[PDB]
Amino acid sequence: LKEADVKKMLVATTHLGVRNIDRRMQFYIFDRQKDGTFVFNLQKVWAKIVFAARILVTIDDPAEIAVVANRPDAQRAILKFCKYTHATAFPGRFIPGNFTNRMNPNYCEPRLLLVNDPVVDRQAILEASYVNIPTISLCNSDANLKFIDVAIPCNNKTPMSIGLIYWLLAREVLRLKGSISRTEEWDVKPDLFVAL
Amino acid sequence: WHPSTKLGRLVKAGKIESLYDIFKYSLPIKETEIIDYFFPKSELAEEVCNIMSVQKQTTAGQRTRFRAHVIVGNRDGFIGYGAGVSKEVANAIKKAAKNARLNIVPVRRGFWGGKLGDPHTVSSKLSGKCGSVRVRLIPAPRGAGIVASPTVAKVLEFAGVSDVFTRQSGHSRTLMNSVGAVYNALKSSYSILTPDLWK
Amino acid sequence: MRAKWAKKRMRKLKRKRRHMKARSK
Amino acid sequence: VRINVLRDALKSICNAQRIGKKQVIVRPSSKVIIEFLQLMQKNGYISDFAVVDNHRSNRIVVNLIGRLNKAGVISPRFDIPANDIEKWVVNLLPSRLFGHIILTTSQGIMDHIEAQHRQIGGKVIGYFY
Amino acid sequence: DDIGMKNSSGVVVDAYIPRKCSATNRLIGPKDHAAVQLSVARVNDKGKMIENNYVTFAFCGAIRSRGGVDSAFMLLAQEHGLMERL
Amino acid sequence: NLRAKLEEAMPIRRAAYSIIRTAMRAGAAGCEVIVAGKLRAQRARANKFKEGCLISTGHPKRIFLAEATRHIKMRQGVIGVKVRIYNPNIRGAVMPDKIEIGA
Amino acid sequence: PVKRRNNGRSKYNCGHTNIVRCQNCHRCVPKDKVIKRFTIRNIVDNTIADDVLNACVIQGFAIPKLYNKVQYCVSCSIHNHIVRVRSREDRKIRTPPK
Amino acid sequence: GKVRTKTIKRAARKIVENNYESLKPKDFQNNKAICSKRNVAIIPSKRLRNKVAGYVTTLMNRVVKGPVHGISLRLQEEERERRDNYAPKKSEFDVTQQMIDSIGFKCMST
RNA sequence: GCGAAGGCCGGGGGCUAGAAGGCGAUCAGACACCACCGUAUUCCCGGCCGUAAACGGUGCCGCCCCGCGGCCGGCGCGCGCGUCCCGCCGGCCGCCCAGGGAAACCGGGAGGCUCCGGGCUCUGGGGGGAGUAUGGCCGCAAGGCUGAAACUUGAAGGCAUU
């Protein structure tokens, strides 16, 4: 991890988590605020972002990774992530049958998946499990990891926090393959990914 | 024929060697044309059994539709049981055949005692349950044959299991449930971790 | 309550059968 | 009350394997439990097991490798004649080639194959396949 | 010493040998459609770039339904070196 | 053609399907053949074999639907057959409901 | 078969509860199987409320509220529409409507 | 008063996006002439054409003021894209303490 | 040994309701529902009785098992310090991952079971006839408990779909 990213995550509120928690999610949680908000150790969050990035880089066709989100705040972030890292995008409704119905107008057979919220995108994860497709998801303290192969701890609700996490991932995916070096900071700003 | 799935498109190239390759990656087969690609000589043996007339009561009267069940398999190591329902007996048989080819699964097979050469029995005691009926497929000596109910016997001839000792538990008069059970047991043939596959 | 009424009818008839045996023996 | 120490142990191992847990704890440790597990460790079905001392019945932390499929006990332990062993193996174990039936013998707790080689039979403690 | 059922000749018989789940050592059956085989890349000391070679990880449908795959993966990656044990 | 096939003892499904494909190859959007009478039974059935899209009502039924009725005679008793063929593109007129629209 | 898990009454850790009488039908129903709706209505009708206040000589008078608990049997409640036959899924919803 | 049929409605939505520049919002007669060109739209039937042209007029008044779903406006698309690709200057986003100290980064400490 | 209610046997007591009984309606009839009057009863004491859809229609003791909440009792840990918070143990619950089941559903089991074995008790074996008959025991009685056969019939039953 780097110091600049930590301060950016602190203004992101990525560390902040919901007042409800899951036993599987406890490893990531660092501590609980007096109100009940569960902070996440940012270093543990970062290790997930880079571990997930390595898996995203192992696909030969980057346009065969489907990024799906129903959350309104997540819409801009997923599209920006798809522009910077070539990838299929599903904005708004997932549309049932997208991954299982051959005659779907949006028929995509992906070899990975990205979902902003396990709850808001329950249908997407369910279909990925019908066709052998892995799944990577951004997860808050109440995380049902059923059918979620890899999960990145984050607020995932705050509009800004959703934007930074996709930017932190886009950035690192692009760096691992080539493009921007990890020495040279990305020209694109994470405020582009966040939607007012 | 135009391949509809990115797997069927790798099968139109010939990139896939054998049905077993796909089974080792547990892939879902969606086009019956892919099974036909790996079965060139007159496809594979197919049998129609239990064509049932099912009636839905309407205001006007009962709507009779036909549920056919079809087993497809080579006489070596593959078995698929599928079912279709159509008002036309023939249409349902075609749908059943298509479903049967789509659900073709491998059978491990094995030796009761002597390991002289070709596997002749089931690998272990395999069990499957559909509705009430539960089946028990137990290895048999080379002298024994398929000791099974006529319906289960056809499924074991079309799976390449020469000799097996079988016991059915439940209403095995329901042939749809009966074939389903001996198919689910023959789908567990590659799900059992034996000391042979421990490495 | 036909089953309860059935046992009420039965009890009434067994009581009568006891009375007839009491008249004899 | 706790009539069978071994049954609870092999149930608590099978439940752990189904969950996919690598290590489990057995609340009461017996000498016959250790002998049954030792047989599974010499057959590769289990991994290292450590008996902690609580100064009472003792606990066992068992390591697993996903290899074991089913472990059970036959209760009451029925003495098996030498020529009856094969009839038990044709029902209790899948395949004459794989599996193990653990029987307490005068020589000691041994698998059915070891008992067959020594041509002696004994009371069946349980089975692991 | 090979991973297949053998005969008297010792030739591996049957057909294909099913994958085993990395975390639970459980044979992925032919019709298990929730099984996944995602891989994780490794990075070089200079430039931190992928070596075009990755470690594959097969997970069974059952461990995915359990929801333990996420924790499994980290521990398996830590053993494989890709993740820092921490 | 169907009446001859039925007198040749062709199976009703086989005979009807043969008529349907010939009409579909000639471009009818829908071909429907209905055979009615005592089909190998003393009770009367009415097996209707249809493929594609066929309109049912309106003035377009007069313009776009060719409805032909026969009374094929079998030994057990008269088997009346109706063949209905619908062509939206008959050159002279267009389907009122269809809107051609534009680029 | 068994339509409801609660068996239609809230009896937990109990073998016998008190007996309540349905107000309309005068029947004996257990306390657990009773409608129990508590209503606070003002003593007067809301149409005649303001004119009572104007007429009232006492300054700062507040109109009395009537506090009553109406308990009914299932038959003496479904027929008055206090409770309604629900869909099998809707039956499970325990939240009060509105 | 009379609910429009799905064929009339669907066709009208296709006509409005294709001829958004050609159509005018509050005039049925002006829009009837556009729809009956046998080029940008071929509608058989005088009554069907009149019915489609009337929906089109209603939908055009909606397009100018608070546009509705199913219609693709190139004019709105460029403005939406401009904000979507807009960059917010220096990005304020660029500029739990125990957790920061736990990493050891101790950013902004003291 | 205990055991709701009703019943019974002695003493009392007697407000209400109210098996019976009587009335007024209703209706084709109505000695039913509804109104009205009212005896036993309801209540207490000393006994009998021994039964209920006595139900969680789910025996008892033991082990493991998946999350997520509510409540109740006791206790411990932080913390300003609150009828907080996080546990622990016992109980009562709701949802439910597997898993099971003919399914409804169960999931603190109806899971770990045709891959079947922790211990113990009880009960069932197509539907009637029939809980009848007879014999025994028990009770003052009502009745309880134990409990047939001859003979008859091809279904009875469960759950779910339309």
UniProtKB/Swiss-Prot annotation, chain A:
GO terms for biological process: ribosomal small subunit assembly; translation. It is found in: Cytoplasm. It comes from the Eukaryota. GO terms for cellular component: cytosolic small ribosomal subunit. GO terms for molecular function: structural constituent of ribosome. The keyword Lipoprotein does not apply. Required for the assembly and/or stability of the 40S ribosomal subunit. Required for the processing of the 20S rRNA-precursor to mature 18S rRNA in a late step of the maturation of 40S ribosomal subunits. Belongs to the universal ribosomal protein uS2 family. Component of the small ribosomal subunit. Mature ribosomes consist of a small (40S) and a large (60S) subunit. The 40S subunit contains about 33 different proteins and 1 molecule of RNA (18S). The 60S subunit contains about 49 different proteins and 3 molecules of RNA (25S, 5.8S and 5S). Interacts with ribosomal protein S21. This is Small ribosomal subunit protein uS2. It comes from Giardia intestinalis (strain ATCC 50803 / WB clone C6) (Giardia lamblia). The chain holds residues 15 to 210 of 245 of the full protein.
